[PDB]
Symmetry: C3
Subunit: 144 residues, 3 copies
Amino acid sequence: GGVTDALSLMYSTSTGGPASIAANALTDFDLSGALTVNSVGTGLTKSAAGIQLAAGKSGLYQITMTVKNNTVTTGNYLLRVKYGSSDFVVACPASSLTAGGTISLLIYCNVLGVVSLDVLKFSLCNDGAALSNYIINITAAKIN
Amino acid sequence: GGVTDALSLMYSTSTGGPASIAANALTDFDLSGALTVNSVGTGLTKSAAGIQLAAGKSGLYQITMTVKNNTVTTGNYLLRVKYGSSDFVVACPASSLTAGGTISLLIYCNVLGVVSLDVLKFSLCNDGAALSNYIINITAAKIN
Amino acid sequence: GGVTDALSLMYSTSTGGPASIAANALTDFDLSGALTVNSVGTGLTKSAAGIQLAAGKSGLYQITMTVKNNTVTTGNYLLRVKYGSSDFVVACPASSLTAGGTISLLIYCNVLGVVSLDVLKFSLCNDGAALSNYIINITAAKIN
């Protein structure tokens, strides 16, 4: 029967992202100006903090964030997703064939009802170069 | 209630894969001869191009591709999944304990109704050696 | 409508994990003493072997295991998930910004009805240092 809530975004320098994502650092992304590719329900909404979870929406969430920045083919792409006190990370070695990275997660999210706390945060970068030619996709879906 | 469509494949030199996957290159996999491990519905079907999405099947898709080739324990395993104009990648450092790699994604797929365009494409390799001893699994499920 | 079965665990030295996870080796985790963060249904239960699948529960499973051990920022974090004869792996380069790793999978699980065979096994480590300051999360959900 599908899922009750979901949000899929496209993030780039033209769609709400920083003109240049600094090298070797992780600053959470303001997602208010991201392009909404698909939306289901009203429990997940973009904001300057990341992706907000509406009250009463505790449960299991499937999350994916990917990045391609074909001009940066060296170093490692660092990706991070946070929720409350938990944070999840991964490092993806860059190459000409894999100019970017991916992080996917199935996590349990407890919603306290404090908008500034109930938010999925996202960030990524390359540890050796700035990114100003990226296509980033962020999708989250409540599967239970 | 489960999902409406899903396909899980097992790909090897004995089940439709190349006798030898060339090193440091990414050629999309012909999946017509892959072993169907599990199948749900009729929206996702294997083909020479990858995994076809039937008309009217736009939505959210959960995808995973993994590989084990225990004889190749050096370099990085490069994995890639494509759909339309988007492509997702990841690099996984090889070791004797981790002789392979993994890429998982939750992406939104828009189905235009052009079989040759509406297809999930898959490819992987090792950046320093050819693979001729691999077990590859590819699973895709429409979750919304 | 959500999922029929799911289990989300929090594993640490205080919640059932080894006082010290040996370097460069993969020993499956005894999950009997892990903290149950969320539980759905009765098909997935923790045990000394990993996460048990109840009889009649064959199907598609979404799995994620993550680790953070902020004091170990070098080498690669090696993660592995096994089920029956299949095993899936990934390596995640460590850094101060990414002190850990992630592995996510959508796999098909055939349940034979042999408790000691129908179990998801988990293990991870750092290839250059022991881990005694970790927060590990393991979540599995039957999506079909």
